[PDB]
Coordinates of C-alpha atoms in Angstrom, one line a residue:
Chain E
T1 CA -35.9 24.6 -12.3
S2 CA -35.2 26.5 -15.6
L3 CA -34.0 23.3 -17.2
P4 CA -33.7 23.3 -21.1
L5 CA -36.5 20.7 -21.7
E6 CA -39.1 20.5 -24.5
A7 CA -42.4 22.2 -23.4
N8 CA -44.4 18.9 -23.2
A9 CA -41.6 17.0 -21.3
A10 CA -41.2 20.0 -18.9
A11 CA -45.0 19.9 -18.2
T12 CA -44.9 16.1 -17.4
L13 CA -41.8 16.6 -15.2
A14 CA -43.6 19.5 -13.4
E15 CA -46.6 17.1 -12.8
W16 CA -44.2 14.3 -11.7
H17 CA -42.4 16.6 -9.2
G18 CA -45.9 17.6 -7.8
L19 CA -46.9 14.0 -7.3
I20 CA -43.6 13.1 -5.5
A21 CA -43.9 16.2 -3.3
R22 CA -47.5 15.1 -2.3
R23 CA -46.1 11.6 -1.8
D24 CA -49.2 10.4 -3.9
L25 CA -48.6 8.8 -7.3
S26 CA -52.3 8.2 -8.1
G27 CA -52.6 10.5 -11.1
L28 CA -49.3 8.9 -12.6
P29 CA -50.6 6.6 -15.5
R30 CA -51.8 9.8 -17.3
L31 CA -48.1 10.8 -17.6
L32 CA -47.1 7.4 -18.9
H33 CA -47.0 6.1 -22.5
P34 CA -49.3 3.0 -22.7
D35 CA -46.2 0.9 -23.5
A36 CA -43.9 2.7 -21.0
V37 CA -40.9 0.7 -19.8
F38 CA -39.4 0.6 -16.2
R39 CA -35.8 -0.4 -15.9
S40 CA -35.2 -1.6 -12.3
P41 CA -31.9 -1.0 -10.4
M42 CA -32.4 -4.7 -9.4
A43 CA -33.2 -6.5 -12.7
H44 CA -32.1 -6.5 -16.4
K45 CA -35.6 -7.5 -17.7
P46 CA -37.6 -4.3 -18.0
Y47 CA -41.2 -3.9 -16.8
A48 CA -43.4 -3.3 -19.8
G49 CA -46.7 -1.3 -19.8
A50 CA -48.2 1.7 -18.0
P51 CA -50.1 -0.4 -15.5
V52 CA -47.0 -2.4 -14.4
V53 CA -44.8 0.8 -14.4
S54 CA -47.3 2.8 -12.3
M55 CA -47.5 0.0 -9.8
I56 CA -43.7 -0.4 -9.4
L57 CA -43.1 3.3 -9.1
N58 CA -45.9 3.5 -6.4
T59 CA -44.1 0.6 -4.6
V60 CA -40.6 2.3 -4.8
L61 CA -42.2 5.6 -3.7
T62 CA -43.4 3.9 -0.5
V63 CA -40.1 2.1 0.2
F64 CA -37.8 5.2 0.1
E65 CA -37.7 7.1 3.4
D66 CA -36.1 10.7 3.7
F67 CA -36.3 11.0 -0.2
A68 CA -34.9 14.2 -1.5
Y69 CA -34.0 15.4 -5.0
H70 CA -30.7 17.1 -5.7
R71 CA -29.2 17.8 -9.1
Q72 CA -31.4 17.8 -12.2
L73 CA -29.7 17.3 -15.6
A74 CA -31.3 17.5 -19.1
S75 CA -30.1 16.0 -22.4
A76 CA -29.4 18.4 -25.3
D77 CA -32.6 17.2 -27.1
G78 CA -34.8 18.3 -24.1
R79 CA -36.4 14.8 -24.0
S80 CA -34.3 13.1 -21.3
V81 CA -33.8 14.1 -17.6
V82 CA -31.8 12.7 -14.7
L83 CA -33.1 13.5 -11.2
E84 CA -30.4 12.8 -8.6
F85 CA -31.8 11.8 -5.2
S86 CA -30.8 10.8 -1.7
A87 CA -33.0 8.4 0.4
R88 CA -32.8 5.6 2.9
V89 CA -34.2 2.0 3.1
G90 CA -34.3 1.3 6.8
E91 CA -30.8 1.6 8.2
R92 CA -29.3 2.0 4.7
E93 CA -28.6 5.5 3.4
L94 CA -28.5 5.5 -0.4
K95 CA -28.0 7.6 -3.4
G96 CA -29.8 7.3 -6.8
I97 CA -31.0 8.6 -10.1
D98 CA -34.4 8.7 -11.9
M99 CA -33.4 8.7 -15.6
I100 CA -36.6 9.6 -17.5
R101 CA -37.0 9.7 -21.3
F102 CA -40.2 11.5 -22.7
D103 CA -41.6 11.2 -26.3
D104 CA -42.4 14.3 -28.6
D105 CA -45.9 14.4 -26.9
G106 CA -44.3 14.6 -23.4
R107 CA -45.3 11.0 -22.4
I108 CA -42.9 9.0 -20.1
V109 CA -41.6 6.2 -22.5
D110 CA -38.6 4.9 -20.4
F111 CA -38.0 5.2 -16.6
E112 CA -34.6 3.9 -15.5
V113 CA -33.5 3.9 -11.8
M114 CA -30.0 3.3 -10.4
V115 CA -29.0 3.1 -6.8
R116 CA -25.6 3.2 -4.9
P117 CA -23.8 1.8 -2.8
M118 CA -24.3 -2.0 -3.0
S119 CA -25.7 -2.1 0.6
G120 CA -28.4 0.5 -0.3
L121 CA -29.3 -1.5 -3.5
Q122 CA -29.5 -4.8 -1.4
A123 CA -31.9 -3.1 1.2
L124 CA -34.1 -1.6 -1.6
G125 CA -34.4 -5.0 -3.4
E126 CA -35.2 -6.8 -0.1
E127 CA -38.0 -4.3 0.6
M128 CA -39.4 -4.2 -2.9
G129 CA -39.8 -8.0 -2.9
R130 CA -41.2 -8.0 0.7
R131 CA -43.8 -5.4 -0.6
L132 CA -44.3 -7.4 -3.9
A133 CA -46.8 -9.7 -2.0
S134 CA -50.1 -8.0 -3.1
Chain T
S1 CA -22.5 19.9 -27.4
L2 CA -24.4 20.5 -24.1
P3 CA -25.1 23.8 -22.2
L4 CA -21.9 23.4 -20.1
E5 CA -19.4 26.0 -18.8
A6 CA -16.5 26.5 -21.2
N7 CA -13.9 25.0 -18.9
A8 CA -16.1 22.1 -17.8
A9 CA -16.9 21.4 -21.6
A10 CA -13.1 21.4 -22.3
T11 CA -12.3 18.9 -19.5
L12 CA -15.2 16.7 -20.7
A13 CA -13.9 16.8 -24.3
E14 CA -10.4 15.7 -23.0
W15 CA -12.1 13.0 -20.7
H16 CA -14.0 11.7 -23.8
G17 CA -10.8 11.5 -25.8
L18 CA -9.0 9.7 -23.0
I19 CA -11.8 7.0 -22.7
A20 CA -12.0 6.6 -26.5
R21 CA -8.2 5.8 -26.5
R22 CA -8.8 3.5 -23.4
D23 CA -5.7 5.3 -22.0
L24 CA -6.3 7.5 -18.8
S25 CA -2.5 8.4 -18.4
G26 CA -3.4 12.2 -18.7
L27 CA -6.2 11.9 -16.1
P28 CA -4.4 13.5 -13.0
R29 CA -4.3 16.8 -15.1
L30 CA -8.2 16.9 -15.3
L31 CA -8.6 16.2 -11.5
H32 CA -8.8 18.7 -8.6
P33 CA -6.0 17.8 -6.1
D34 CA -8.7 17.0 -3.6
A35 CA -11.1 15.3 -6.1
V36 CA -13.5 12.7 -4.6
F37 CA -14.6 9.4 -6.1
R38 CA -18.0 7.9 -5.1
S39 CA -17.9 4.2 -5.8
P40 CA -21.0 2.3 -7.0
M41 CA -19.9 -0.4 -4.4
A42 CA -19.0 1.7 -1.3
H43 CA -20.5 4.4 1.0
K44 CA -17.0 5.9 1.9
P45 CA -15.6 8.2 -0.9
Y46 CA -12.0 7.9 -2.2
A47 CA -10.4 11.3 -1.5
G48 CA -7.5 12.8 -3.5
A49 CA -6.4 13.0 -7.2
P50 CA -3.8 10.1 -6.9
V51 CA -6.4 7.7 -5.4
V52 CA -9.2 8.9 -7.8
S53 CA -6.9 8.5 -10.9
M54 CA -5.9 5.0 -9.8
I55 CA -9.5 3.7 -9.3
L56 CA -10.7 5.4 -12.6
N57 CA -7.8 3.6 -14.4
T58 CA -8.7 0.3 -12.8
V59 CA -12.4 0.6 -13.7
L60 CA -11.1 1.1 -17.3
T61 CA -9.4 -2.3 -17.3
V62 CA -12.6 -4.1 -16.1
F63 CA -15.4 -2.6 -18.3
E64 CA -15.8 -4.6 -21.6
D65 CA -17.7 -3.2 -24.7
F66 CA -17.9 0.2 -22.9
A67 CA -20.1 2.7 -24.9
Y68 CA -21.5 6.1 -24.0
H69 CA -25.1 6.9 -24.8
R70 CA -27.1 9.9 -23.4
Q71 CA -25.3 13.0 -22.0
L72 CA -27.2 15.3 -19.7
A73 CA -26.1 18.6 -18.2
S74 CA -27.3 20.4 -15.0
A75 CA -28.7 24.0 -15.4
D76 CA -25.5 25.5 -13.8
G77 CA -23.3 23.9 -16.6
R78 CA -21.1 22.5 -13.8
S79 CA -22.4 18.9 -13.7
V80 CA -22.8 16.2 -16.3
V81 CA -24.2 12.7 -16.4
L82 CA -22.7 10.3 -19.0
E83 CA -24.9 7.3 -19.5
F84 CA -23.1 4.1 -20.5
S85 CA -23.5 0.4 -21.4
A86 CA -20.7 -2.1 -20.7
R87 CA -20.2 -5.8 -19.8
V88 CA -18.2 -7.7 -17.1
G89 CA -17.8 -11.2 -18.6
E90 CA -21.4 -12.5 -19.1
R91 CA -22.8 -9.6 -17.1
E92 CA -24.4 -7.0 -19.3
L93 CA -24.6 -3.7 -17.4
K94 CA -25.8 -0.1 -17.5
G95 CA -24.3 2.8 -15.7
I96 CA -23.7 6.6 -15.2
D97 CA -20.6 8.7 -14.7
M98 CA -21.9 11.8 -12.7
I99 CA -19.2 14.4 -12.9
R100 CA -19.1 17.8 -11.1
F101 CA -16.5 20.4 -12.2
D102 CA -15.2 23.6 -10.5
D103 CA -15.0 27.2 -12.1
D104 CA -11.6 26.3 -13.5
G105 CA -13.0 23.1 -15.2
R106 CA -11.3 20.7 -12.7
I107 CA -13.1 17.4 -11.8
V108 CA -14.1 17.7 -8.1
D109 CA -16.6 14.9 -7.7
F110 CA -16.9 11.7 -9.8
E111 CA -19.8 9.5 -8.8
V112 CA -20.5 6.1 -10.6
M113 CA -23.8 4.0 -10.4
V114 CA -24.3 0.7 -12.1
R115 CA -27.4 -1.5 -12.7
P116 CA -28.7 -4.3 -12.4
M117 CA -27.5 -6.0 -9.1
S118 CA -25.8 -8.9 -11.1
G119 CA -23.8 -6.3 -13.1
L120 CA -22.7 -4.4 -9.9
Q121 CA -21.7 -7.7 -8.2
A122 CA -19.5 -8.6 -11.2
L123 CA -17.9 -5.1 -11.3
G124 CA -17.1 -5.1 -7.6
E125 CA -15.7 -8.7 -7.8
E126 CA -13.4 -7.8 -10.8
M127 CA -12.3 -4.4 -9.3
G128 CA -11.0 -6.2 -6.2
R129 CA -9.4 -9.0 -8.2
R130 CA -7.5 -6.3 -10.3
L131 CA -6.4 -4.3 -7.3
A132 CA -5.2 -7.6 -5.7
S133 CA -3.4 -8.4 -9.1
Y134 CA -1.6 -5.0 -9.1
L135 CA -0.5 -5.5 -5.4
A136 CA 1.0 -9.0 -6.1
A137 CA 3.9 -7.1 -7.9
Chain U
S1 CA -5.2 -30.2 20.9
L2 CA -7.3 -31.7 18.1
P3 CA -6.9 -35.1 16.2
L4 CA -4.7 -33.5 13.5
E5 CA -1.8 -34.8 11.5
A6 CA 1.5 -33.8 13.2
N7 CA 2.6 -31.5 10.4
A8 CA -0.8 -29.9 10.0
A9 CA -0.9 -29.4 13.9
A10 CA 2.6 -27.7 13.8
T11 CA 1.5 -25.2 11.0
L12 CA -1.7 -24.5 12.9
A13 CA 0.3 -23.9 16.1
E14 CA 2.5 -21.4 14.1
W15 CA -0.5 -19.8 12.4
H16 CA -2.1 -19.3 15.8
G17 CA 1.1 -17.6 17.1
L18 CA 1.2 -15.3 14.1
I19 CA -2.5 -14.2 14.6
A20 CA -1.9 -13.7 18.4
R21 CA 1.0 -11.4 17.5
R22 CA -1.2 -9.8 14.8
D23 CA 2.0 -10.1 12.6
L24 CA 1.7 -12.4 9.5
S25 CA 5.3 -11.7 8.2
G26 CA 6.2 -15.4 8.5
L27 CA 3.1 -16.5 6.6
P28 CA 4.7 -17.4 3.2
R29 CA 6.6 -20.2 4.9
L30 CA 3.3 -21.9 6.0
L31 CA 1.8 -21.7 2.5
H32 CA 2.1 -24.1 -0.4
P33 CA 3.6 -22.2 -3.4
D34 CA 0.3 -22.9 -5.3
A35 CA -2.0 -22.2 -2.2
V36 CA -5.5 -21.0 -2.9
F37 CA -7.6 -18.4 -1.0
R38 CA -11.4 -18.6 -1.3
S39 CA -12.8 -15.1 -0.3
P40 CA -16.1 -14.7 1.6
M41 CA -16.8 -12.0 -1.0
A42 CA -15.9 -13.6 -4.4
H43 CA -16.4 -16.8 -6.4
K44 CA -13.0 -16.8 -8.1
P45 CA -10.2 -18.0 -5.9
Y46 CA -6.8 -16.2 -5.4
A47 CA -4.1 -18.5 -6.6
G48 CA -0.5 -18.6 -5.4
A49 CA 1.3 -18.1 -2.1
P50 CA 2.3 -14.4 -2.8
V51 CA -1.4 -13.4 -3.5
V52 CA -2.7 -15.5 -0.6
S53 CA -0.1 -14.1 1.9
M54 CA -1.1 -10.5 0.8
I55 CA -4.9 -11.0 1.2
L56 CA -4.4 -12.8 4.6
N57 CA -2.2 -9.8 5.8
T58 CA -4.8 -7.3 4.6
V59 CA -7.8 -9.2 6.2
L60 CA -5.6 -8.9 9.4
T61 CA -5.6 -5.1 9.2
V62 CA -9.4 -4.9 8.9
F63 CA -10.7 -7.3 11.6
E64 CA -11.2 -5.5 15.0
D65 CA -11.6 -7.4 18.4
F66 CA -10.7 -10.7 16.5
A67 CA -11.1 -13.8 18.7
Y68 CA -11.0 -17.5 18.0
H69 CA -13.6 -19.8 19.6
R70 CA -14.4 -23.4 18.5
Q71 CA -11.8 -25.4 16.6
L72 CA -12.9 -28.5 14.7
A73 CA -10.9 -31.1 12.8
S74 CA -11.9 -33.4 9.9
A75 CA -11.5 -37.2 10.4
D76 CA -8.4 -37.2 8.0
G77 CA -6.6 -34.7 10.3
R78 CA -5.9 -32.6 7.2
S79 CA -8.6 -30.0 7.6
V80 CA -9.5 -27.5 10.4
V81 CA -12.3 -25.0 11.0
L82 CA -11.3 -22.1 13.2
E83 CA -14.5 -20.3 14.4
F84 CA -14.0 -16.6 15.1
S85 CA -15.8 -13.4 16.3
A86 CA -14.6 -9.9 15.1
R87 CA -16.0 -6.4 14.3
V88 CA -15.6 -4.0 11.3
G89 CA -16.5 -0.6 12.8
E90 CA -20.1 -0.9 14.2
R91 CA -20.5 -4.3 12.4
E92 CA -20.3 -7.2 14.8
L93 CA -19.4 -10.3 12.9
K94 CA -19.0 -14.1 13.0
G95 CA -16.7 -16.2 10.8
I96 CA -14.7 -19.3 10.0
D97 CA -11.2 -20.0 8.6
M98 CA -11.5 -23.4 6.9
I99 CA -7.9 -24.5 6.3
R100 CA -6.8 -27.6 4.3
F101 CA -3.1 -28.8 4.7
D102 CA -1.0 -31.3 2.6
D103 CA 1.1 -34.3 3.9
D104 CA 4.0 -31.9 4.6
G105 CA 1.8 -29.6 6.7
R106 CA 1.7 -26.8 4.0
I107 CA -1.5 -24.7 3.7
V108 CA -3.1 -25.6 0.3
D109 CA -6.6 -24.1 0.6
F110 CA -7.8 -21.3 2.9
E111 CA -11.5 -20.6 2.7
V112 CA -13.2 -17.8 4.8
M113 CA -17.0 -17.3 5.4
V114 CA -18.5 -14.4 7.4
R115 CA -22.0 -13.8 8.7
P116 CA -24.4 -11.8 8.9
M117 CA -24.8 -10.0 5.5
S118 CA -24.1 -6.6 7.2
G119 CA -20.8 -7.9 8.6
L120 CA -19.8 -9.3 5.2
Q121 CA -20.7 -6.0 3.4
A122 CA -18.5 -4.0 6.0
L123 CA -15.6 -6.5 5.5
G124 CA -15.7 -6.4 1.7
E125 CA -15.9 -2.5 1.7
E126 CA -12.9 -2.2 4.1
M127 CA -10.8 -4.9 2.2
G128 CA -11.2 -2.8 -1.0
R129 CA -10.5 0.5 0.7
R130 CA -7.2 -1.0 2.2
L131 CA -6.1 -2.5 -1.1
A132 CA -6.8 1.0 -2.7
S133 CA -4.8 2.6 0.2
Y134 CA -1.8 0.4 -0.4
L135 CA -1.8 1.0 -4.1
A136 CA -1.9 4.8 -3.6
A137 CA 1.8 4.5 -2.6
Chain J
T1 CA -18.3 -41.0 9.0
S2 CA -16.1 -42.3 11.9
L3 CA -16.0 -38.7 13.4
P4 CA -14.9 -38.4 17.1
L5 CA -18.3 -37.3 18.4
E6 CA -20.1 -38.1 21.7
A7 CA -22.5 -41.0 21.4
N8 CA -25.7 -38.9 21.7
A9 CA -24.4 -36.1 19.4
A10 CA -23.4 -38.8 16.8
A11 CA -26.9 -40.4 17.0
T12 CA -28.6 -37.0 16.4
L13 CA -26.2 -36.2 13.5
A14 CA -26.9 -39.6 12.0
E15 CA -30.7 -38.8 12.2
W16 CA -30.1 -35.3 10.8
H17 CA -28.1 -36.8 7.8
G18 CA -30.9 -39.2 7.2
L19 CA -33.6 -36.4 7.1
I20 CA -31.5 -34.3 4.7
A21 CA -30.9 -37.3 2.4
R22 CA -34.7 -38.0 2.3
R23 CA -35.1 -34.2 1.7
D24 CA -37.9 -34.4 4.4
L25 CA -37.3 -32.5 7.7
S26 CA -40.6 -33.5 9.4
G27 CA -39.1 -35.6 12.3
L28 CA -36.7 -32.6 13.1
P29 CA -38.2 -31.0 16.3
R30 CA -37.4 -34.3 18.1
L31 CA -33.6 -33.6 17.5
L32 CA -33.9 -30.0 18.8
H33 CA -33.6 -28.6 22.3
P34 CA -36.9 -26.8 23.2
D35 CA -35.0 -23.5 23.4
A36 CA -32.7 -24.3 20.3
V37 CA -31.2 -21.3 18.6
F38 CA -30.8 -20.7 14.8
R39 CA -28.1 -18.2 13.7
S40 CA -29.0 -17.1 10.1
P41 CA -26.3 -16.3 7.5
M42 CA -28.5 -13.2 6.8
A43 CA -29.2 -11.8 10.3
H44 CA -27.5 -11.1 13.7
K45 CA -30.6 -11.6 15.8
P46 CA -30.9 -15.4 16.4
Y47 CA -34.2 -17.4 16.0
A48 CA -35.1 -18.8 19.4
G49 CA -37.2 -21.9 20.0
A50 CA -37.5 -25.4 18.5
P51 CA -40.8 -24.5 16.5
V52 CA -39.1 -21.4 14.8
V53 CA -35.8 -23.3 14.2
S54 CA -37.6 -26.3 12.6
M55 CA -39.5 -23.9 10.3
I56 CA -36.5 -22.0 9.1
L57 CA -34.5 -25.1 8.6
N58 CA -37.4 -26.6 6.5
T59 CA -37.5 -23.3 4.5
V60 CA -33.7 -23.3 3.9
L61 CA -33.8 -27.1 2.9
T62 CA -36.4 -26.2 0.2
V63 CA -34.4 -23.1 -1.1
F64 CA -31.1 -25.0 -1.7
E65 CA -30.9 -26.8 -5.0
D66 CA -28.0 -29.4 -5.8
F67 CA -27.2 -29.6 -2.1
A68 CA -24.2 -31.8 -1.3
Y69 CA -22.2 -32.3 1.9
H70 CA -18.4 -32.4 1.7
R71 CA -16.0 -32.1 4.7
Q72 CA -17.3 -33.0 8.2
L73 CA -15.2 -31.6 11.1
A74 CA -15.7 -32.3 14.9
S75 CA -14.6 -30.2 17.9
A76 CA -12.3 -32.0 20.5
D77 CA -15.2 -32.2 23.0
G78 CA -17.3 -34.2 20.5
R79 CA -20.3 -31.8 21.0
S80 CA -19.8 -29.5 17.9
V81 CA -19.7 -30.4 14.2
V82 CA -19.2 -28.4 11.0
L83 CA -20.8 -29.9 7.9
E84 CA -19.3 -28.2 4.8
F85 CA -21.7 -28.0 1.8
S86 CA -22.1 -26.9 -1.8
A87 CA -25.5 -25.8 -3.2
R88 CA -27.2 -23.3 -5.6
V89 CA -30.0 -20.7 -5.2
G90 CA -31.2 -20.3 -8.8
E91 CA -28.3 -19.1 -10.9
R92 CA -26.0 -18.7 -7.9
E93 CA -23.6 -21.5 -7.0
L94 CA -22.7 -21.2 -3.3
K95 CA -20.6 -22.7 -0.6
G96 CA -21.6 -23.1 3.1
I97 CA -21.4 -24.6 6.5
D98 CA -23.9 -26.0 9.0
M99 CA -22.2 -25.5 12.4
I100 CA -24.2 -27.5 15.0
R101 CA -23.6 -27.6 18.7
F102 CA -25.3 -30.5 20.7
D103 CA -25.8 -30.7 24.5
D104 CA -24.7 -33.6 26.8
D105 CA -28.1 -35.4 25.9
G106 CA -27.4 -35.0 22.2
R107 CA -30.1 -32.3 21.6
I108 CA -29.3 -29.6 18.9
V109 CA -28.9 -26.4 21.1
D110 CA -27.2 -24.0 18.4
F111 CA -27.5 -24.2 14.6
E112 CA -25.4 -21.6 12.8
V113 CA -25.2 -21.3 9.0
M114 CA -22.7 -19.3 6.9
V115 CA -22.7 -19.0 3.1
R116 CA -20.1 -17.6 0.6
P117 CA -19.7 -15.7 -1.8
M118 CA -21.7 -12.5 -1.4
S119 CA -23.7 -13.2 -4.6
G120 CA -24.8 -16.6 -3.2
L121 CA -25.8 -15.1 0.2
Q122 CA -27.8 -12.4 -1.6
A123 CA -29.7 -15.0 -3.6
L124 CA -30.3 -17.2 -0.5
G125 CA -31.7 -14.2 1.5
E126 CA -33.9 -13.1 -1.4
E127 CA -35.5 -16.5 -1.7
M128 CA -35.8 -17.1 2.1
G129 CA -37.8 -13.8 2.3
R130 CA -39.9 -14.6 -0.8
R131 CA -40.8 -18.0 0.9
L132 CA -41.3 -16.2 4.3
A133 CA -44.9 -15.3 3.2
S134 CA -46.8 -18.2 4.9

């Protein structure tokens, strides 16, 4: 809520929260830096570029069932946020974080996701690949 | 310096000093007797300061080239996320220590997450190998 | 009775008796001092009779409703595969104990495989939880 | 080689070995019982029927790289065999077993596969699903 973020970063986060709540990530590329990077909980190699990033985030948003945000933590520079969440992928109840870095202008530049436990990560990865057909 | 509660900030300062020295002998002092550890590997938490101290000491013997990066605080000044990079052999990894403290500054919940899958696999493998090594006394 | 070497057959008979009693206290006697254990979880083997005995005793405290089914022998009468069914909580599982013996009938290699993925995950989780429990002495 | 199997079972195994060596499982359904079952190292639910079984086995045969058979063990009734193998799925070096049960007539009735370690199983499952598109 009253998180000590930079005005621009706070505005993007507010918009991001609104998209997730509506379970509709269509307006998302507007919030992304053209060269935004996505760091998968599954892979080392990041996904470079706003089109690719928007597509993976939309895929991930459809895979997670019973998605709920919990703790929200901000870095001292007001440009990075960690959004703690709970979710499930089929039978697997998981726990995770959306670690978002914004630039001075409030654009999402880095979006890093981590999931726990192993079983939850496995289920997420399985479904992401199954959905990564078309 | 982050917008943390005084006591939480003091424990974090001590925790940082312990990690920098790569010596968690003073760790049971920072933990709540009923502290919980949430493994990046397992669903079931590890309950109690003795168990928690032991796993946190073990995890310390596994992580190579461990380095802290971003540090983020929750608005209540009771929770912190310490972003880190590390390696387990050839496996380059990325992770978080998500620590929740009480009013008195004691660690109550310590949740770890690691990425990518390959890094998590390597961590789990080595954690088990170490615990097996310690038991073969 | 399988077409096994006399000594191998005698160790297998003793191993079966130990498992039936759910008491592997006599296990170090059946192992070669340099015996190797190949985990269904990990790549890296566990070397030495003390380590091997300890993991095989631990695996014994995890498997519920453990039952042996088919028993198959290699043509050299030095290797055996003991097919089993077991459960880890809700996780119904299937597995094999693939044992290699020496001329003297000592266990030299003990390789375990478990299926399906869900069963293996549950086994690994519990194995680690037990080793953590034993170390919290 | 000189494994104490029933004549019919031995003949099917000989044919199975020949297909694997040629890395061509086209003549396979002939060796299968119409109601043959495949027990995946990935799933509990078996795959019922010779058409389904032949298809998964062909898929698995294409996924495994550097496939090599090692120990071969026979049950005392000469109707079950365990074929120990080494293989790799991309970066992952694995170890496994083909546990085949034959009927009196030598038809494959049950084909159960197990793979170790966890990392190898994960890689196998990932690739099987990726290939389970068409």
